[PDB]
Amino acid sequence: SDRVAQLTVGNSSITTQEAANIVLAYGEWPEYCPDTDATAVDKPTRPDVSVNRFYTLDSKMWQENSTGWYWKFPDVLNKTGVFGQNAQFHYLYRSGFCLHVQCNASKFHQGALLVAVIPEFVIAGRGSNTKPNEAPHPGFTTTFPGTTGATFHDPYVLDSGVPLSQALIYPHQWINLRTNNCATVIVPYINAVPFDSAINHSNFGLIVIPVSPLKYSSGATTAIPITITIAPLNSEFGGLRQAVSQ
Amino acid sequence: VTNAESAANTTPSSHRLETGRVPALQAAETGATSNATDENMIETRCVVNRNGVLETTINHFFSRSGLVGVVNLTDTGYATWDIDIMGFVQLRRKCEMFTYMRFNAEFTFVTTTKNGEARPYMLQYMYVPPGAPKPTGRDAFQWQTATNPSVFVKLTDPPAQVSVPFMSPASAYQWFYDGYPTFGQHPETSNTTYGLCPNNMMGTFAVRVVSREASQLKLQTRVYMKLKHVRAWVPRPIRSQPYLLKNFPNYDSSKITNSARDRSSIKQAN
Amino acid sequence: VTNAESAANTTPSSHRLETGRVPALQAAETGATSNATDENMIETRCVVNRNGVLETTINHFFSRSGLVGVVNLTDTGYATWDIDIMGFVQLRRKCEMFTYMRFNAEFTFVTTTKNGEARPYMLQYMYVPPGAPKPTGRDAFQWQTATNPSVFVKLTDPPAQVSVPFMSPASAYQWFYDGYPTFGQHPETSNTTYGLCPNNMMGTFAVRVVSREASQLKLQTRVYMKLKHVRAWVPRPIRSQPYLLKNFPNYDSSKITNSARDRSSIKQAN
Amino acid sequence: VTNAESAANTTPSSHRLETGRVPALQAAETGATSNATDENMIETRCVVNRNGVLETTINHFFSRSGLVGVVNLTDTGYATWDIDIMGFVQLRRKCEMFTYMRFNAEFTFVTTTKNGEARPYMLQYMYVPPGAPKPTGRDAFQWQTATNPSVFVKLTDPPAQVSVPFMSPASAYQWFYDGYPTFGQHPETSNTTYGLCPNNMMGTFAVRVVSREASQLKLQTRVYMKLKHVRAWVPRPIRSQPYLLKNFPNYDSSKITNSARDRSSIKQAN
Amino acid sequence: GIPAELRPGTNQFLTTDDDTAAPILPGFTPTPTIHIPGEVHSLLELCRVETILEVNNTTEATGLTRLLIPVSSQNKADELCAAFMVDPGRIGPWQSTLVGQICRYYTQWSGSLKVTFMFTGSFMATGKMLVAYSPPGSAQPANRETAMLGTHVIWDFGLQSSVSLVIPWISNTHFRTAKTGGNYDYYTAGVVTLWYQTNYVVPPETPGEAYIIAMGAAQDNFTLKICKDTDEVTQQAVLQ
Amino acid sequence: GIPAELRPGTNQFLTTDDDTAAPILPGFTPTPTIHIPGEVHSLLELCR
Amino acid sequence: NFTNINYYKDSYAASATRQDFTQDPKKFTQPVLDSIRELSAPLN
Amino acid sequence: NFTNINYYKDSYAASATRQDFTQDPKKFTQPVLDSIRELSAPLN
Amino acid sequence: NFTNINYYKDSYAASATRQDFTQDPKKFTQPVLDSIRELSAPLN
Ligand SMILES: CCCCCCCCCCCCC/C=C/[C@H](O)[C@H](N)CO
Ligand SMILES: CCCCCCCCCCCCC/C=C/[C@H](O)[C@H](N)CO
Ligand SMILES: CCCCCCCCCCCCC/C=C/[C@H](O)[C@H](N)CO
Secondary structure, three states, X not given: OOOOEEEXXXXXXXXXXXXXXXEEHHHOOOOOOOXXXXXXXXXXXXXXXXXXXXXXXXXXXXXXXXXXEEEEOOOOOOXXXXXHHHHHHOOEEEOOEEOOEEOOOOOOOEXXXXXXXXXXXXXXXEOOOOOOOOOOOXXXXXXXXXXXXXXXXXXXXXXXXXXXXXXXXXXXXXXXXXXXXXXXXEEOOOOOOOOEOOOOEOOEEEEEEOOOOOEXXXXXXXXXXXXXXXXXOOOEXXXXXXXXXX | OEEOOOOOOOOOOOOOOOOOOOOOEEOHHHOOOOOOOHHHHOOOXXXXXXXXXXXXXXXXXXXXXXXXXXXXXXXXXXXXXXXXXXXXXXXXXXXXXXXXXXXXXXXXXXXXXXXXXXXXXXXXXXXXOOOOOOOOOOOOOHHHOOOOOEEEEEOOXXXXXEEEOOOOOOOOEEOOOOEOOOOOOOOOOOOOOOOOOHHHOOOEEEEEEOOOOOOOOOXXXXXXXXXXXXXXXXXXXXXXXXOOOOOOOOEOOOOOOOOOOOOOOOOOOO | OEEOOOOOOOOOOOOOOOOXXXXXXXOHHHOOOOOOOHHHHXXXXXXXXXXXXXXXXXXXXXXXXXXXXXEEEOOOOEEEEEOOXXXXXXXHHHHOOEEEEEEEEEEEEEEEOOOOOOOOOEEEEEEEOOOOOOOOOOOOOHHHOOOOOEEEEEOXXXXXXXXXXXXXXOOOEEOOOOOOOOOOOXXXXXXXXXXXXXXXXXXEXXXXXXXXXXXXXXXXXXXXXEEEEEEEEEEOOOOOOOOOOOOOOOOOOOXXXXXXXXXXXXXXXX | OEEOOOOOOOOOOOOOOOOOOOOOOOOHHHOOOOOOOHHHHOOOXXXXXXXXXXXXXXXXXXXXXXXXXXXEEOOOOEEEEEOXXXXXXXXXXXXXXXEEEEEEEEEEEEEEOOOOOOOOXXXXXXXXXXXXXXXXXXXXXXXXOOOOOEEEEEOOOOOEEEEEOOOOOOOOEEOOOOXXXXXXXXXXXXXXXXXXXXXXXXXXXXXXEOOOOOOOOOEEEEEEEEEEEEEEEEEOOOOOOOOOOOOOOOOOOOOOOOOOOOOOOOOOOO | OOOXXXXXXXXXXXXOOOOOOEEOOOOOOOOXXXXXXXXXXXXXXXOOOOEEOOOOOOOOOOOOOOOEXXXXXXXXXXXXXXXXXXXXXXXXXXXXXXXXXXXXXXXXXXXXXXXXXXXXXOOXXXXXXXXXXXXXXXXXXXXXXXXXXXXXXXXXXXOOOEEEEEEOOXXXXXXXXXXXXXXXXXXXXXXXXXXXXXXXXOOOOOOOEEEEEEEEEEOOOOEEOOEOOOOOOOOOOOOO | OOOOOXXXXXXXXXXXXXXXXXXXXXXXXXXXXXXXXXXXOXXXXXXO | OOOOOOOOOOHHHOOOOOOOOEXXXXXXXXXXXXXXXXXXXXXX | OOOOOXXXXXXXXXXXXXXXXXXXXXXXXXXXXXOOOOOOOOOO | OOXXXXXXXXXXXXXXXXXXXXXXXXXXXXXXXXXXXXXXXXXX
């Protein structure tokens, strides 16, 4: 009554037979914007069916000597589905998300993963250069990876000068290959403004760093994938105009 | 929500000899901190704790003055300083402990001389908001300050001190901004505008010596900022790597400093 | 007459499909501003506005100090200044935004030296009303100030500051006067007295160094005026042309500066 | 427990002629002070005493300022002083009259020059708690005092004065500690750690001249401490031997000073 | 004019002073607040979260295998796995956690600690451990019979893959200075050791090498006194 | 600003003065007291 | 102890206002949905 | 917030008195004689 | 005589508080167990 679960959101469902919990980020639920905190005058739109559903990304192979991956959360979904059309035609965007990262393995594989959300996960440019105009900066396909993700170069500092050891102050879970196979986080809309564009600003970002690397014996399955499914809970848009890709 | 001072006291406990009640076996795979306390593991006594925790709020932790910037005036005639408190690594790390912060401020101006003294001259401090014209000379018309707030103080006076409100267009100051300020084709080589929040640009701080001819002194005014009425949101880990730039969280690829000093073996506590 | 703070909030609105009710078609030929609001044109939501408009009154807009005049004292021994605030174009334009103004004042006296310093000398500021004899020397009998208000202050003191009431014979100060002060045959060539309101001549402001011999310093005292308890009437457009004279609204016939900068075409917003 | 001011008055008494009632024969072998009073020995009169004893409490006896330490600054650039009040034998003996003391403090800083004057320079006093890094230069980063309490005062100002609370980890300050701070093999020759209470180490007091170049003056700042809200326990005899060391009660084996001056004979009062 | 004398403390700028100041902007109202999730009110909310310790901070550990305690199968009984000091204001494993970076801003701490061990290994690998805390006194124990004389816990790798050893507040003084070394070994807290209680038993066709992830946090009665500045941040020149 | 003149005795440091002082540590509570036997309250207890 | 007293109309120029001891550690330490007891196994 | 306090008999030496939010925009925006509705044609 | 007035939240920065005339000389002068009278022989 605690390990089996089903998460029906829209016309999509997620079944699992061994999980641990569902961490609720900062103990709060994704809500609609109240009339007190709102500042825009135009009426917002609410599809409520076509955008609040589980979108599944491509799978990431988990090699033995892997470093990690990271995705921006309002940016992985801009070309896929009706959510990308809504977040390309409109100008303002407010929604929470509902994470789920699956990584199944047999009872003879060992390893663990740390999955977490990092609000305002700013990517740092690597290189010793204390000169404003000569310093290195990350490219556009590194700050905003897209739907194909991006790998870490130094997962020990989260590619931002911040220790991974104390990265447990974030809403997170573990995927221990002996206990569970799925980590899920229900994150609300965290921002300093009530509404914000979904093309220039990426609210937060998932990180999956493989601590205690994958180990197995000969004869077992080598290809161990990693699949993540997102659900934009309580999406609402505003400021309809011409569609802009990026 | 509980509101109390001191510290949670302990209660008397005895030994437990039964099955099914296991307070020690936790499960960290759920992303929750363990809730096992003193009384359930070991036999304990009763104590009444009086160790006040008033000094651990985020309003007593930040309400302490601290150097934010230094302004060298040669006497070009004047000197400017773009207001950004992320220039000295002492008050930058405490503010970067958090993601969003909403607070009032209180700046203190301490001006000295080259060798260190206080000659009875006069100084004008002028705050230039975003959009107001910066002064182009020591006897320009911008110094008429018909609307800009200015302070006229001497070197032989106590250090000047003003109070500054929350002057941001957003609802809070964010130090980390995961995005670009504008639309368009962003480059792959030199993203010189990534992680630049426009809600934190507060203007320019100018200073001149009120005179007609040129005074032959090289001054140096230090700005000491203190935070008050501070609210904080979304805590985040404290930085361990040395700072390189001022507006960017750049670190060094090689020679990454470990977050714990080395010892001989893993089976030797000392 | 309505009295409220914040800002008028909006109300929810739906679409209208009917004839005879047209809120968008106005008629500017009646000299009245259009009264169409947000709700009637587009479908809107409900918001509660809290954006305070306290900072937009004519009493917070004028209650800011500002340079009105400068008085150069060579030490003739003394120096005079006919009180007229229309000499610097920063505080002149805000006051010429209106036609009639009734207010109290608060003058601040900031005196410096040639190179800029404050030597411990003594200064006497004396106000000479219209009709009182102006001083003719640095050791004359007019400085005995048996009835004129005077201020004795040093250079090493804080800047002096006094409060001045509404001292006009009319009911308000008018900046624009469409007439002549006297009767008679007015000339066609040089009307050197047109637009000269006699209700604004307030007197002369004199300053000397209190001594017996001559002090070898060239001072410079700046008068900073601040308005308070201000009432305004009959608003009028703000001036766009550069100022030429002090008591006259003269402009330049040739090279008239347009009130909007040029662009390429009329079909290109940028 | 009795609480009263003035002094216990006497009562009238007459002669006693009886057996068995002997108030004069005491017995000092019981370790108790004799309780015989005036009235029982001699015939006395009645008096009402009004000689107030308010000036004999341990709170009026210690609430008097007194030199605790002197700090010589040459301008190394800076100067430090480990806080320990047992360096001058005037306030050390009154505090060593008692074993345990719990009190607040109030330090006063009096800084002079070599020949004795007060040049208008600036001084920074910084308190370094145990564990905080001591400054290594006159322009180091420790002087940024983002958390350490600091005082910026001039030489031409009144002497600085701050209030300090009870900052000990134990419940009271003990001056005499009959033990060692650590475990292990203690030596027989040089016990350089006997009688060293770790609950009295309060940190380091640093002082610098706030400047950039080097100021050519030799200063000397005297620290005047005053006790207040003082509680005392376990009184002990006052020292009669001259002091030799600072943290140790060492005396001289030879030439022991007698606690009473010599006279000719034992049968000659004068 | 009312008579008024000036006292010592005039014209001084105390850094940690609570006083008013003249406002630059008269009649100002800031931007209205909104509801941002995750508001902090005290620093005692950040100390009660588990955070991986760097118990493997020895040399020859490369970049990320410094957070892992290697476990394998032994040949002699009563073996030892790892050991580390308890002092959070000390250089070592507690330097990499979140409570040991907040207790470094303050020069005093008090209350109980908490260390949580999570076992990342195969599902078929059983075993038992004896993690034992020892108050001050002699050095680190050499035998398991000496280590079991303190306050130990017997944790066995089962379905629940995490145990928590609470470190009780056993001290003489009410508080402890977060600066040990020298004459400050009077404020030491003790040694936490982890022992190979029975063995690490593994079936065939399964790796015989696993890892334990140690985490650390504060307790309900944790408190701190007297703020200071940390020793980490070093700055030569201004960040231009 | 309220008018106020300065009197003799300004800027002097009297040793036996009873006055307040600015506290260096804001929001501080000391170590709790315990019961230590033999508390003195006056110096007239040591003279008897 | 009169300290809260202000001397201007602007409220942001006052001292440190009322010290409220608000503390909700249940949102950083136990954010899971299903409330877990502390005397039972987390995963039944 | 004591600020209105004066210290002389002359009332013109005080601070900025009571802030009244008086506002009559109907004399600059709609000064016509015949009151026009906003949901009808101005000139019938 | 207003002197006790403080001006901060910290109570250790005030003046010399209430002067209590507490005095128990019976613990230094007569600490013996058996209470001895002053009009009789100490050792009967
Ligand atoms: C001349 C006297 C008045 C001086 C006014 C200076 C204060 C105006 C700037 C407000 C400062 C707000 C605090 C810092 C704001 C942002 O966080 C910084 N830009 C950080 O980058
Ligand atoms: C020496 C100390 C007292 C100085 C008194 C100077 C103030 C007396 C003049 C009153 C000024 C009223 C404000 C300006 C009046 C008219 O509008 C100007 N003439 C404008 O042309
Ligand atoms: C720079 C301004 C603040 C200066 C702070 C200095 C006071 C901090 C030290 C507290 C002194 C407590 C009284 C003396 C304590 C112990 O008894 C001494 N170590 C005696 O050896």
